Amino acid sequence: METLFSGIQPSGIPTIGNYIGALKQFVDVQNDYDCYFCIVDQHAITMPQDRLKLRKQTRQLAAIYLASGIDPDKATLFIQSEVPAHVQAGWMLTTIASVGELERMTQYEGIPAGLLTYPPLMAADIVLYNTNIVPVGDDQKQHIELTRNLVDRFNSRYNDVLVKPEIRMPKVGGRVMSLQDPTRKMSKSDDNAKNFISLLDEPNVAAKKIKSAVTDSDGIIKFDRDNKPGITNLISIYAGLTDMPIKDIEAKYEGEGYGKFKGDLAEIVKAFLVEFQEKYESFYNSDKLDDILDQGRDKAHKVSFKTVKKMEKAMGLGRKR
Amino acid sequence: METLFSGIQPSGIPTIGNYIGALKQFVDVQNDYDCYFCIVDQHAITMPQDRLKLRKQTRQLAAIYLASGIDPDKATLFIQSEVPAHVQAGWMLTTIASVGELERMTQYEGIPAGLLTYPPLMAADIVLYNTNIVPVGDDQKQHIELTRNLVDRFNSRYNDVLVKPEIRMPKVGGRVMSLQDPTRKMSKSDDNAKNFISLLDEPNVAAKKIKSAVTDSDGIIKFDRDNKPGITNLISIYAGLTDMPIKDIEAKYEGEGYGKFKGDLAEIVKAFLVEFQEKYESFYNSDKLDDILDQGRDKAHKVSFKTVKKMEKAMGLGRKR
Ligand SMILES: C[C@H]1c2c[nH]c3cccc(c23)S[C@H]1C(=O)O
Ligand SMILES: C[C@H]1c2c[nH]c3cccc(c23)S[C@H]1C(=O)O
């Protein structure tokens, strides 16, 4: 069984685009892959953070992953800073990186040193669990290249302990676009809040965002990205939240106009968020949330500890006991 | 009671200069100060190392400190990599350092990133124990300036948890010079091995190095650094290993020439090393050595854990449990 590792930034609420594109897919793929979901709070502080904003966002993310169906027994959901092997292995990989290498990553009061030195910590986050696949996008290519190059450098200079990972998302979800700019991907941090639908938006606000999404005044419910990216995007969201095949959507709405379809979809979005947010409140406001995160941390520590120990033996850190 | 922290590089055997200058003094000052002696193996790998050479040197250093009289109950002798708070607090301080700052430290395959990014780890090594004093020399000034500046930056941006340290050696020992270059300090890494006397030199080899030390052919046993740095240096070693006051040395050897004095001193050096190396073998070849280092690690972990936790709460890492 292949091991998957996904880093999660506690820096914002995922949108419904992120749910359809990734989270919903993770809820399936956790049965067929050994999955790690790591809330990378030590990466979040490479940037300036309010300390209450950061600690709250970390709980929020954990509650959202659990609300989506990420299962603490099937997968390992934990907080990066609670597992010390991450900064231990990150320091070891830092000593074999080069300054030139780290600088080129930054390209693809002063400048915080975290922004230069975080890539080896990302490498560590991955290889500590013998990861085979990382579900990232084009923007993370140079990071994985550095990771694989460091695994090569380590195994070559000391001895084979580390595994090279690949970029692979096992079941890619649909691509969800901004509601009022259908050529751009939906983003949690848009200045036009009508562009996205946050997982924590009020369900009635989200229904309004479906109605205000930029489309023709009317048309047929047909999937055509090149010529009608607006309605096509909406059909993608419909498909994403109901699992109805797209061709099966077209047939349900044959002879229907936009008003009927946007009305049904806004209701579908509202219904989804009401069910999602009840689960989310229930995890977020519960004592069991700390129990779950405790157990996740213990799972990850058991695996990552063995790896750190092999690494320390390979470089000659510590003692032979 | 003031807390003292001394980093120890596992990169070479201390010389008798290092014993007279520092180690012997630490054996006294550990009664009057809360002392931490930390074998910084995570700093040693910033440079290229053979992994067996490094792990052996680490045991050797611990055995030498114990052989000198460093007392595992009075002081805390441990190995840096066995206490995870060091790289945890080092990462936190890294995120508030600036690249410019770290670069200027480097001034005062490529260039290993460890050589750029180690100073915040040094800062962490110190402040984790609420250190008041660090017994370092001129070459470490910019490192302590960075440390104090990071303590200021941390306490100012989040809230007061960290203590500013000072450079202070509570009882400075004598200065011991190279035996065949009396104007340079004695160094463990000289290309002229007659220049130093290693604590692990064969006692008969060391006696020969006393005889081969570069002096006038004869003279009076008088302390005069400007005009007779050779014999004066030797008198310093004599004073350092026997605790005889220097004026009291001059009076013992009034009416004596160099041959008598160098003969007595070579015997004194031989006698000291025989007693030292028996203790050293006895710790180095013992199962109790791992027990001692275990207990040291547990002592340091208890203090440094509380500090790391205050730091994580201050930046908003982790969870409030
Ligand atoms: C969250 C970040 C991160 C830190 N460690 C990891 C490990 C795997 C994937 C990612 C990460 S994804 C990456 C990003 O920049 O999105
Ligand atoms: C061993 C080095 C080191 C790492 N952490 C610390 C903490 C205090 C003093 C020192 C150190 S002394 C320094 C040196 O360069 O000698």
For residue B102, how far is its CA from the centre of ligand 1 (angstroms)?
A: 25
Q: Which of A54, A113, A290 sits opposite B94 (nearest CB)?
A: A113
* Residue B250: both structure tokens together: 């001059």
The one-letter amino acid code at B195 reads N
Residue with tokens 């940037």: A47
For residue B298, how far is its CA from the centre of ligand 2 (angstroms)?
A: 21
User: Measured between alpha carbons, how far is A121 from A154 in angstroms, rounded to an integer?
Assistant: 14
As beta bridge partners, residue B79 has B39
User: Measured between alpha carbons, how far is B108 from B149 in angstroms, rounded to an integer?
Assistant: 17
Q: Do domains B3-172+287-315 and B177-282 have the same CATH topology?
A: no
- Which residues are CB-contacts of A155 (< 8 A; sequence separation ≥ 6)? A161, A162
Between helix A288-315 and helix B51-68 the angle, nearest 10°, is 100
User: Measured between alpha carbons, how far is B200 from B57 in angstroms, rounded to an integer?
Assistant: 12
Task: Look up residue A20 and give its DSSP letter.
Answer: I
Q: Residue B52: its chain A contacts at CB < 8 A?
A: 316
Maximal C-alpha separation, chain A: 76
Query: Pick from A116, A33, A46: which is nearest to A81 by CA?
Result: A46
Query: Pick from B140, B129, B130: which is nearest to B167 by CA?
Result: B140
User: Measured between alpha carbons, how far is A15 from B195 in angstroms, rounded to an integer?
Assistant: 70
CB contact under 8 A, A102 and B87: no
Q: Residue A114: its chain B contacts at CB < 8 A?
A: 94-95
Q: Please tell me the residue having the least CA distance from ligand 1 atom 10.
A: A7
Between helix B141-157 and helix B99-107 the angle, nearest 10°, is 170
Instruction: Render the burial of A224-237: b for 16+ CB within 10 Å, e for the rest.
Output: eeeebbbbbbbbbb
Q: Which of B51, B92, B116 sits opposite A315 (nearest CB)?
A: B51
Backbone angles phi, psi at A237, to 5 degrees: -65, -45
Please list the alpha-helical segments (H only) found in chain A: 16-18, 24-29, 41-44, 51-68, 85-96, 99-107, 114-127, 141-157, 203-211, 229-242, 246-252, 258-284, 288-315
> Which helix or strand (DSSP H or E) is residue A40 part of?
none
Residue A297 · residue A82 · CB < 8 Å? yes
Burial of B259 per CB tally in 10 Å (0-12, 13-18, 19+): exposed
Is A277 strand, coil or helix?
A: helix
CB contact under 8 A, B101 and A113: yes
- Which residues are CB-contacts of B320 (< 8 A; sequence separation ≥ 6)? A55, B313
CB contact under 8 A, B315 and A54: yes
- Which residues are CB-contacts of B119 (< 8 A; sequence separation ≥ 6)? B97, B102, B105, B143, B146
Is A221 strand, coil or helix?
A: coil
Query: Pick from B219, B223, B214, B258: which is nearest to B244 by CA?
Result: B223
- Which residues are CB-contacts of B183 (< 8 A; sequence separation ≥ 6)? B177, B229
Backbone angles phi, psi at A129, to 5 degrees: -110, 20
Residues belonging to the binding site of A for L-tryptophan are 125
The one-letter amino acid code at A216 reads D
* Residue A212: both structure tokens together: 């205000």
For residue A123, how far is its CA from the centre of ligand 1 (angstroms)?
A: 9
Residue B55 · residue A319 · CB < 8 Å? yes
- Which residues are CB-contacts of A265 (< 8 A; sequence separation ≥ 6)? A210, A234, A237, A238
Q: Which of A98, A102, A321 sits opposite B290 (nearest CB)?
A: A321
Residue A28 · residue A170 · CB < 8 Å? no
Resolution of the coordinates, Å: 2.4
* Residue A287: both structure tokens together: 């004592």
User: Measured between alpha carbons, how far is B79 from B71 in angstroms, rounded to an integer?
Assistant: 15
- Which residues are CB-contacts of B55 (< 8 A; sequence separation ≥ 6)? A316, A317, A318, A319, A320
Residues belonging to the binding site of B are 9-11, 17-18, 125, 137-139, 176, 185-189
3-state secondary structure chain B: CCEEEEEECCCCCCEHHHHHHHHHHHHHHCCCCEEEEEECHHHHCCCCCCHHHHHHHHHHHHHHHHHHCCCCCCCEEEEHHHCCHHHHHHHHHHHHCEHHHHHHHHHCCCCECHHHHHHHHHHHHHHCCCCCEECCCHHHHHHHHHHHHHHHHHHHHCCCCCCCCEECCCCCCCCCEECCEEEEECCCCCCCHHHCCECCCCHHHHHHHHHCCCCCCCCCCCCCCCCCHHHHHHHHHHHHHHCCCHHHHHHHCCCCCHHHHHHHHHHHHHHHHHHHHHHHHHHHCCCHHHHHHHHHHHHHHHHHHHHHHHHHHHHCCCCCC
Residue A170 half-sphere exposure, CB side, CA atoms within 13 Å? 21
User: Measured between alpha carbons, how far is B35 from B299 in angstroms, rounded to an integer?
Assistant: 11
User: Structurally, what CATH architecture does the domain formed by B177-282 represent?
Assistant: Orthogonal Bundle (1.10)
Query: Pick from B321, B312, B306, B304: which is nearest to B158 by CA?
Result: B312
CB contact under 8 A, A50 and B316: yes
User: Measured between alpha carbons, how far is A56 from A305 in angstroms, rounded to an integer?
Assistant: 28
Kindly report the CATH number that applies to the domain delimited by A3-172+287-315. 3.40.50.620
Backbone angles phi, psi at B156, to 5 degrees: -75, -40
> Which helix or strand (DSSP H or E) is residue A182 part of?
strand A181-185
Residue A68 · residue A23 · CB < 8 Å? yes
User: Measured between alpha carbons, how far is A233 from A176 in angstroms, rounded to an integer?
Assistant: 6
Between helix A51-68 and helix A258-284 the angle, nearest 10°, is 110
User: Measured between alpha carbons, how far is A92 from A86 in angstroms, rounded to an integer?
Assistant: 10
CA distances from A257 to A16, A214, A224, A247, A264 (A): 24, 15, 15, 16, 11
Q: In what order do the strands lie in the sheet with A76-79?
A: A76-79, A34-39, A3-8, A133-134, A166-167
* Residue A309: both structure tokens together: 């120990």
B219 φ/ψ sector (left φ>0, alpha ψ -120 to 50, else beta): left
Query: Pick from B294, B308, B306, B305: which is nearest to B76 by CA?
Result: B294
Between helix B85-96 and helix A85-96 the angle, nearest 10°, is 70
Residue A290 · residue B320 · CB < 8 Å? no
- Which residues are CB-contacts of A236 (< 8 A; sequence separation ≥ 6)? A20, A174, A175, A176, A177, A246
User: Measured between alpha carbons, how far is B60 from A308 in angstroms, rounded to an integer?
Assistant: 24
As beta bridge partners, residue B4 has B35, B133
Burial of A188 per CB tally in 10 Å (0-12, 13-18, 19+): middle
Residues belonging to the binding site of B for ATP are 9-11, 17-18, 137-139, 176, 185-189
Q: Which of B49, B55, B319 sits opposite A290 (nearest CB)?
A: B319
> Which helix or strand (DSSP H or E) is residue A183 part of?
strand A181-185
- How do strand B34-39 and strand B76-79 relate by DSSP bridges? parallel
Q: Which of A8, A40, A105 to mutate to test the pocket of ligand 1 (most atoms within 8 A of CB)?
A: A40
User: Measured between alpha carbons, how far is B167 from B49 in angstroms, rounded to an integer?
Assistant: 29
A316 φ/ψ sector (left φ>0, alpha ψ -120 to 50, else beta): left
A207 φ/ψ sector (left φ>0, alpha ψ -120 to 50, else beta): alpha
Q: Using alpha carbons only, how large is chain B's radius of gyration in Å?
A: 22
CB contact under 8 A, B113 and A120: yes
Per-domain residue ranges of chain A: 3-172+287-315, 177-282
User: Measured between alpha carbons, how far is B67 from B277 in angstroms, rounded to an integer?
Assistant: 8
Residue A109 half-sphere exposure, CB side, CA atoms within 13 Å? 12
CA distances from A235 to A45, A201, A268, A274, B39 (A): 38, 20, 12, 20, 63
Q: Residue A42: its chain B contacts at CB < 8 A?
A: 91, 317
* Residue B202: both structure tokens together: 């064969």
Residue A3 · residue A37 · CB < 8 Å? no
As beta bridge partners, residue A15 has A198
* Residue A98: both structure tokens together: 């080069």
Task: Look up residue A13 and give its DSSP letter.
Answer: P
